Amino acid sequence: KYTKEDIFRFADEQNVKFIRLQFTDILGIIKNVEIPVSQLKKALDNKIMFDGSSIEGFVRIEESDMYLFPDLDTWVVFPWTAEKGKVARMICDIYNPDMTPFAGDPRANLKRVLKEMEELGFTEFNLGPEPEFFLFKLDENRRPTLELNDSGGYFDLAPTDLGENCRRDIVLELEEMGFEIEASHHEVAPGQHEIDFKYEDAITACDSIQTFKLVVKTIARKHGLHATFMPKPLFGVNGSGMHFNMSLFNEKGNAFFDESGELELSQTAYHFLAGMLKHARGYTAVTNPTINSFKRLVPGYEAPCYIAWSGKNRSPLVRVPSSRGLSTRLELRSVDPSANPYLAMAVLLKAGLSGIKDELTPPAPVDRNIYGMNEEEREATGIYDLPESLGHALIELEKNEIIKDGLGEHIFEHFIEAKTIECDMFRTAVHPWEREQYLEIY
Amino acid sequence: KYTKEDIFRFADEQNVKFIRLQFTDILGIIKNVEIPVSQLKKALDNKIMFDGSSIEGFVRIEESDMYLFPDLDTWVVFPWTAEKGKVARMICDIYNPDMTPFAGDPRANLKRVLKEMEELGFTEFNLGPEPEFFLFKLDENRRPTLELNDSGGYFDLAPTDLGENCRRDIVLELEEMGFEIEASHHEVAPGQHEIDFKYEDAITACDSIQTFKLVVKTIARKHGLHATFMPKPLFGVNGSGMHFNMSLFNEKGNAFFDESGELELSQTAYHFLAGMLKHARGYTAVTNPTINSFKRLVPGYEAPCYIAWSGKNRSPLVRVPSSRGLSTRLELRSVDPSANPYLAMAVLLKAGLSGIKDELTPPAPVDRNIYGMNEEEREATGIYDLPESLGHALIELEKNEIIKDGLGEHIFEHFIEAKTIECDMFRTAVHPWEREQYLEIY
Amino acid sequence: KYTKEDIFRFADEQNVKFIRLQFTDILGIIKNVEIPVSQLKKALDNKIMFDGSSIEGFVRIEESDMYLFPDLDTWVVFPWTAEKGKVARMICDIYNPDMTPFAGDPRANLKRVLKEMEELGFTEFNLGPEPEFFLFKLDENRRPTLELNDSGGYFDLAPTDLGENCRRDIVLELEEMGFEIEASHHEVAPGQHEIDFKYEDAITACDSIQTFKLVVKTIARKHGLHATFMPKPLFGVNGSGMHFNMSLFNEKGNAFFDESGELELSQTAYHFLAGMLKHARGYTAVTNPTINSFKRLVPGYEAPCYIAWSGKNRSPLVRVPSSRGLSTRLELRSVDPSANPYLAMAVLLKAGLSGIKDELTPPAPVDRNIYGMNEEEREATGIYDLPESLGHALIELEKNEIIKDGLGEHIFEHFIEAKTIECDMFRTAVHPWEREQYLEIY
Numbered sequence A, B, C: 001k002y003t004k005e006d007i008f009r010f011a012d013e014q015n016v017k018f019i020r021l022q023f024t025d026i027l028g029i030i031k032n033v034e035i036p037v038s039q040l041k042k043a044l045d046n047k048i049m050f051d052g053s054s055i056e057g058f059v060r061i062e063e064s065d066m067y068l069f070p071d072l073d074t075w076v077v078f079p080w081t082a083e084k085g086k087v088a089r090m091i092c093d094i095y096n097p098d099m100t101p102f103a104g105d106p107r108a109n110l111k112r113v114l115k116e117m118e119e120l121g122f123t124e125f126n127l128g129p130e131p132e133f134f135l136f137k138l139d140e141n142r143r144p145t146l147e148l149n150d151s152g153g154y155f156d157l158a159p160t161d162l163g164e165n166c167r168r169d170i171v172l173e174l175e176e177m178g179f180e181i182e183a184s185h186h187e188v189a190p191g192q193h194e195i196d197f198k199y200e201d202a203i204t205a206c207d208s209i210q211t212f213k214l215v216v217k218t219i220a221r222k223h224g225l226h227a228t229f230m231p232k233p234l235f236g237v238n239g240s241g242m243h244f245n246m247s248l249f250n251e252k253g254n255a256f257f258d259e260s261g262e263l264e265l266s267q268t269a270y271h272f273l274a275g276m277l278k279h280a281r282g283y284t285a286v287t288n289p290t291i292n293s294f295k296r297l298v299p300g301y302e303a304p305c306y307i308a309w310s311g312k313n314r315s316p317l318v319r320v321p322s323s324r325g326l327s328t329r330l331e332l333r334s335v336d337p338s339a340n341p342y343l344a345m346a347v348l349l350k351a352g353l354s355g356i357k358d359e360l361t362p363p364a365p366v367d368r369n370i371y372g373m374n375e376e377e378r379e380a381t382g383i384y385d386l387p388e389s390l391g392h393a394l395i396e397l398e399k400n401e402i403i404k405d406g407l408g409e410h411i412f413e414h415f416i417e418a419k420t421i422e423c424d425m426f427r428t429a430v431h432p433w434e435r436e437q438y439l440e441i442y
């Protein structure tokens, strides 16, 4: 743990002229408040209020006042605000003025369900994500447009890769913030890039994910580009999906490692699988909270459409990397980077360890092309489709209780009313698709 | 009736020059062909054949060849500027290479189910439809714009209803084609138009419907405006429905008319409703065979939203016009003018005739305005909500096996497939609404 | 030879910041992935993998996860990567996750055929390339226009060769990267360029080739010019193909130099050419693997048109440069820079190592201008005619089962699929040519 006092003098060895307290709203969006180095004790002693009412996902305007308490380990300095004022960073948890924490804080609802594996013995919850992102050219307005940075491809090179000089500026801006970056490259769709790093403690891997998305964006609008974490911005091309590499640690040993099994996977991992897969239909409404996230979960674009799993195969809902070692992990790939990392982790922790506790037995590893299977030749194998509309997936989540009770009373009730009414805008609205399709033939 | 010896007489009488053989495809699309008056006798020998694989939903390409047998009762000369190109049409029944009526021919389907009221004792099946349509301007190159001629409202007056020479010229041309016209006016939303005509038996009111769209499609395009029967071409204004006013007749009798029961309504009628009411869930993919009509089917714009009935009231599924007697009608507002009036009539007959052989005890009249209740108030009565989408409205249909038997087994087999892919063709696509709300946001 | 101890040294000596792991897909398309020096150990431990399903022609999606084993004798720093993000490269080999190598990987297909020359006693199957490219200007939005920056001819000078300082800044950039470069000059057709570099043993020239292209694409786009290797980009002017200057060696002695035989040429030398002459029809699908290069193979433009050889003459399929000694070389000419430098060598090795176990008494020099002979004489001497299209070269390929074996089999069946697709995706399409010559005509 970082100290409170040596943080006060952390600003004098680097003359930090501002600190940015930052937390996260219900929809995954990073809100912020900036304060000078002048107010540093006023925040470290937890006396910084705000207006709760206007942050979508919090209390009503009657009980508006809400305080902010910093997590003194999430101290980095913003490397690009040299020369103006060296700007630090600190992540906060949201507290009601009763000094009772807020059960609607997205970072509390993981800070609590990470203690249920405490009651049953595991060291850590290791998340290494793969947040994929597209990049679009800007204009004279510097207001983004739907023309991608290159008509490139998977692993292709300059001249065909025009973010080669951009990703590289993004990775060295992230590494200056104390990361360990695995690789950098261009994904299979045009303008689609992927920067993956090394796994971390569940919450400090989640904190690190809200870091990444802010660096990828500010350092692109510095390259003439704009970075989108929208899952399916085009038709008929790979979507951007934030893979979920999960692995529990236990006393300096990967909980998933069976040293001399055939699939070298402990029967902990095997009842971990049946956890999410049983519950897959419920919780994905959370892990893909935008209507468009389903417009991406279609057959053919390396995205999963059916609830299943296999080994080193990129069709199913979960993939097992053929390399395990101490990096042994199972790859839930039905996560896209519009969900809340704090909330996808909490949900999938619960309904995931619910499979070892209940000891659920795991279904068949479907080792072929899941997209190449008849409507009725996969219906004999029991595997069935992931829900197609947000209305459908919200019904099958609200139905589910095991994940509904790790979503908090205040978050779920504040969530489905936001996802439904977001979806009614859709169902009521007519798009220019429908004009094209009908207006002249009828 | 009309003998073959009339048609020749009328040709050499009215001096027609070319003959058209119209029929209607699976989706509602009147498709015809031209022959000289030198062919007049050959078509009446019913020895004139077209490409069967080439009209949607009819047949496959290995049994392409299919015959056209005209209906001499339909003869009407086309009255536009054709002195030398004077026309004459005849709506065709479709037959096989073995002369048996074609299962797919929807003109056959209507008549087929019509013989199911010849055994419940009813002379006719009258239908007075209200096909409401929109008027759009045309560009310099005669392509449909997205502006509408005027910005008037219900019943408005010149100079704020541009289509007042338009409908004038629409109505007159119809009055030449054997029509008797009731009225011509402006509807709720701007550039919308209602033209009404006296009821007729189905296979002749619907022939007065397929004739209607054409002679508004063309006469409106003679005033330089393209006309649509798209349900809701603009979000936030009344989708144009095509109200379905019907009546069964009994030895010169309006079989819904007995001036005693609760409203001066009969029992063959009070029973009819419970058939619709019960089977209404399962016939909305036929009354509304398009993704877009489910966008008129949000409430507030005088369209049906839930499955209940009332009097004098334009909010429910079925309104009953106060005027009664011969004017005693059952008004069904769920149909919109994209639908197939040979499949729509065929189906509702087998919904409501399933309510004279059981009569199924109709539910309560909600004389409120049903748009103004709550999810706890709909459930208080227990009123069925019309389905969500072309998605549900497709599964809700392959349940009602009395309705499936109103389309036939080869018309339903070529109507689920043609909507399934058309439904899938929208489910997968990404339309601009998805990028506005998310691209610059996530 | 270089050791993994040497590369831990240079990264801290050069102070490089990223390592790029590179390979080639089936089509000659370079695909590489960038990683920090912070992961220099994981690749030298071979513990870095990728997605095989996305490398065009590597594998199919069910068994994707595949390893990356790096080659150290391939290490070079990039020189254009300032002191801010300096870059070191390493060409790799592909290993299936079970640590067995990949039969579809082209680099090891060569290694296996270069072992077929250890059974015949040959230290080196040396190769010198002549990749010829075009230069197209760049528009305002960095898009390669249809203008050639210069309108010159052979060996011309400033000011009638724009890319004079271009071919300078490439050479230096090549010269920083351990290259030995012969000659930098303007080629025949306008806006054409050649850069000759001295030979190296096959797998290291194939490295030096795919590398050399990357250095001209990226440098040419510094001066803002698209660098392309399309064989016949313009019709009616010289095609830019990649000559193949090959020579065998045994104990520091060229195996083709014996100043007794008629042309100062050896026996294995003369014998080699029969191994190509007959087999030439077969591999002309691997040396010209594109629709476009079969318009280059036409007569007139100093490119092989029929299968023939001769001395100091630049019409035939094989040229033999007058200069002999250690520069005693055989010049194959069908190849275009769109061919796979790994496939071509293992093809031509097994092709021309077939003329040393069989040797087929190679035919005699038609040292005429074979560009100027009518059909009455081409089948007089019996000179085989080259295939006329991709689709012809393919059927001509699946018969010489030794070239087929030269390719392995995975590469082969992965090859016939896509080119038959490519050949068929061009057989069926319609291009504005046929629209001029027939539309207003017929």
Ligand SMILES: Nc1ncnc2c1ncn2[C@@H]1O[C@H](COP(=O)(O)OP(=O)(O)O)[C@@H](O)[C@H]1O
Pocket: A126, A127, A128, A129, A130, A182, A196, A197, A198, A199, A243, A245, A246, A247, A254, A321, A326, A327, A328, A329, A331, C049, C050, C051
């Ligand atoms: N034991 C583990 N638990 C969780 N995540 C891991 C583990 N080992 C590796 N990872 C993560 O897997 C990710 C690999 O990224 P990438 O190479 O894009 O995956 P893929 O092989 O699916 O393409 C990294 O983010 C890394 O942190």
Ligand SMILES: Nc1ncnc2c1ncn2[C@@H]1O[C@H](COP(=O)(O)OP(=O)(O)O)[C@@H](O)[C@H]1O
Pocket: B126, B127, B128, B129, B130, B182, B196, B197, B198, B199, B200, B243, B245, B246, B247, B321, B326, B327, B328, B329, B330, B331
């Ligand atoms: N007895 C009847 N049976 C069936 N349809 C009828 C009957 N009387 C009138 N109609 C139809 O009602 C239509 C007129 O409807 P409209 O004036 O729009 O009434 P509303 O405004 O109540 O819908 C006419 O087209 C006519 O054919």
Ligand SMILES: Nc1ncnc2c1ncn2[C@@H]1O[C@H](COP(=O)(O)OP(=O)(O)O)[C@@H](O)[C@H]1O
Pocket: C126, C127, C128, C129, C130, C182, C183, C196, C197, C198, C199, C200, C243, C245, C246, C247, C321, C326, C327, C328, C329
């Ligand atoms: N003995 C040899 N073995 C292999 N390659 C050779 C030999 N001699 C020359 N080369 C190659 O020939 C190339 C020079 O080609 P170039 O100068 O264009 O000759 P030409 O103009 O006759 O084609 C060099 O790239 C070199 O690698």
Ligand SMILES: C[S@](=O)(CC[C@H](N)C(=O)O)=NP(=O)(O)O
Pocket: A130, A132, A187, A188, A194, A238, A239, A240, A241, A242, A243, A301, A302, A303, A314, A333, C050, C051, C054
């Ligand atoms: C090549 S991809 O394999 C693409 C997967 C897809 N874009 C998605 O996850 O949505 N995934 P990864 O980065 O793990 O290799």
Ligand SMILES: C[S@](=O)(CC[C@H](N)C(=O)O)=NP(=O)(O)O
Pocket: B130, B132, B187, B188, B194, B238, B239, B240, B241, B242, B243, B296, B301, B302, B303, B304, B314, B333
């Ligand atoms: C009030 S309206 O009823 C307009 C109908 C509405 N736009 C609909 O068809 O959904 N039609 P009409 O007055 O002729 O009965």
Ligand SMILES: C[S@](=O)(CC[C@H](N)C(=O)O)=NP(=O)(O)O
Pocket: C130, C132, C187, C188, C194, C238, C239, C240, C241, C242, C243, C301, C302, C303, C314
């Ligand atoms: C006689 S030329 O040979 C002209 C090149 C020709 N257009 C070709 O197809 O290679 N080239 P080079 O002198 O490099 O051998």
